[PDB]
Structure 1
């Protein structure tokens, strides 16, 4: 029973020589005695709260069905042999040296790195969206990188099956995903049940790669929309006409006119092709926002674009009203395939 930073981390005989990383549950690096490579292991203890169970399950379900170079896999799942003895679940994944959040705090990214990082994000996202899945929490800390800059999308805890026919909601509807990467429609009339929600987050990531600073660092729920409008400018009549919800539309109408800040003023050193694609991802109207495959076909990514080498899921992919007890059993059953039995 190996101990790490005053906590039980018993990953069995297979995984040894542990080192702490970060933090519900803990994450450590370890040596895999079967494959002889160092791996990353995430201990999760979610059985108290059903939300933590719901996030654990949907991620396990999605990552076991997914197989893509730019998406984190689940190599192994370590847990007790019985439901009764199962207090923790250890998810074994790809070990990655850094993440884009860490890189952006101290490293100037060359245009070539920005181009390559964006390509891999969108290549991974093409696969996710082809499975009818939305990631819903794309941000630099959810983009892992190795020493050769291979990028992998991680954390599918907030991921959902796309549901565009049930995307509408009222004004100022509470939302869970990281504030700075929230599309403007979340604060106005959207539940984040469409693919266009992830494209917005990738647009934010691209802008952040260009200046090493989040483009819309909102300090609270409605401040997030004010940051977006301060750069995009006031929505056009057309874009306002698409917002039928009276409270959302009238909030936008109450605001003084704001002019669009040109992308090349905000980003004076950026490549013009990168700013043209940025513009199409950071489009106010989600219906006019570029889609992942169009983004991959954009001239900025021409050196990498190869749709034959951009795989899609072999098949498309209720947990809302479900107790933490039933979810414990579902986590136990989904992790059965990894047991030595």
Structure 2
């Protein structure tokens, strides 16, 4: 049993030469060599079974990634856990080895317009796939857009994903759509477009555009740039208590995107504006985003696959005890066990 920084990594003998990459709130990620397939991999050690929401996120991510197959969405190559459910305290998810992520990349490099356009197209190509499966990612941010040595971008971390139906503690809420700060329900695919626009804006300036300390401070950032909501924009707010609060704010002028990002490609700022619209109904959808003139050179519907069939969780996870969720995780991973 190899160890890394004092953590047991019980992935041998198929995976060896483990190197530390980083950590989450309940796991450690290493790179490793897969001796069977003769390829370099990432292995995420997950230890969720003492916490019910960790068990939700683990089940969600396993269920959605196993079902997804797209070039811009991280896959699961293999899963290692113990042969009996009493013995399983850890799940190891094997994935494709990635170099870095867009959070790290933006810390050290300023992206030219060509690279911003290349990255945005890949984000939207993958998102087009996710949404066509009737799934919301719900947590798009720079830190979980991974890049590999080929400079290929892959969306990851679907632990907060939900199946869309229009009729949870997060690290950073800076990419959250305004309607999530305002309402408690009714989240549509629109919330992912907002996040993608928040990421576009960050690639244009190497600083986040709406970095509030809490929900009220986050909203003042949004309105301090978008300007005050229009009359029609206030009507689309569902929660009257929240809608009433926006009316009490003093009027704020809309800062033109040309002034925030004086040096951005005009075609990009136009698309940013259609992604950072306040009204979720008027916000641009993922196909229209892909067809936008900023991505003319990459747009290619014939090379932008979609999901075979809409996702259906087949069960809701919100009320299940963590012992039930461990049972569901054990079942979901049986297919990677020899002899299933």
Q: TM-score, normalised by structure 1?
A: 0.95
Offset of 1:178 from its aligned partner?
3.0
Unaligned stretches of 5+ residues in structure 1: 165-173
SS of equivalent to 1:313: coil
Tell which deviates more after alignment, 217-226 or 311-320.
311-320
Alignment partners' CA distance in 2, 1:335 and 1:246: 44
Deviations 1:70-116 (A, max 9, x none): 00000000111111111100000011101000010010101111001
Q: Check 1:67–1:144 CA distance in 2 against 1; reply closer, same or farther (3 A cut).
A: same
Offset of 1:190 from its aligned partner?
4.5
CA-atom RMSD, angstroms?
Answer: 1.3
Offset of 1:193 from its aligned partner?
2.5
Deviations 1:235-254 (A, max 9, x none): 00111122243211111011
> Is the contact between residue 41 and residue 90 of structure 1 (CA under 8 Å) also seen in structure 2?
yes
Tell which deviates more after alignment, 248-257 or 310-319.
310-319
> Is the contact between residue 136 and residue 192 of structure 1 (CA under 8 Å) also seen in structure 2?
no
> Is the contact between residue 234 and residue 257 of structure 1 (CA under 8 Å) also seen in structure 2?
yes
From 46, 57, 60, give the equivalent of 2:59. Answer: 57
Offset of 1:176 from its aligned partner?
4.0
Alignment partners' CA distance in 2, 1:102 and 1:176: 19
> Is the contact between residue 32 and residue 40 of structure 2 (CA under 8 Å) also seen in structure 1?
yes
- Match of 2:186? 192
Q: How many residues align?
A: 332
Alignment partners' CA distance in 2, 1:97 and 1:239: 42
SS of equivalent to 1:250: helix
Unaligned stretches of 5+ residues in structure 2: none
Q: TM-score, normalised by structure 2?
A: 0.95
SS of equivalent to 2:338: coil
Deviations 1:170-196 (A, max 9, x none): xxxx87473100111111125363100
Q: Check 1:177–1:185 CA distance in 2 against 1; reply closer, same or farther (3 A cut).
A: farther
- Match of 1:96? 98
- Match of 2:49? 47
Deviations 1:32-79 (A, max 9, x none): 101111100000000001100010001100000000000000000011
Alignment partners' CA distance in 1, 2:183 and 2:337: 45
Deviations 1:5-50 (A, max 9, x none): 1111111211000000111211000001011111000000000011
Alignment partners' CA distance in 2, 1:270 and 1:94: 33
Offset of 1:256 from its aligned partner?
0.6
From 158, 169, 194, give the equivalent of 1:175. Answer: 169
Q: Check 1:191–1:177 CA distance in 2 against 1; reply closer, same or farther (3 A cut).
A: farther
SS of equivalent to 2:2: coil
Deviations 1:183-242 (A, max 9, x none): 111111253631000000000000000000011111112111111111000000111122
From 220, 224, 228, give the equivalent of 1:230. Answer: 224
Q: Check 1:175–1:335 CA distance in 2 against 1; reply closer, same or farther (3 A cut).
A: closer
> Is the contact between residue 122 and residue 295 of structure 1 (CA under 8 Å) also seen in structure 2?
yes
From 316, 335, 338, give the equivalent of 1:337. Answer: 335
Deviations 1:279-334 (A, max 9, x none): 00000000000000100000000101111111111011910110111111110110
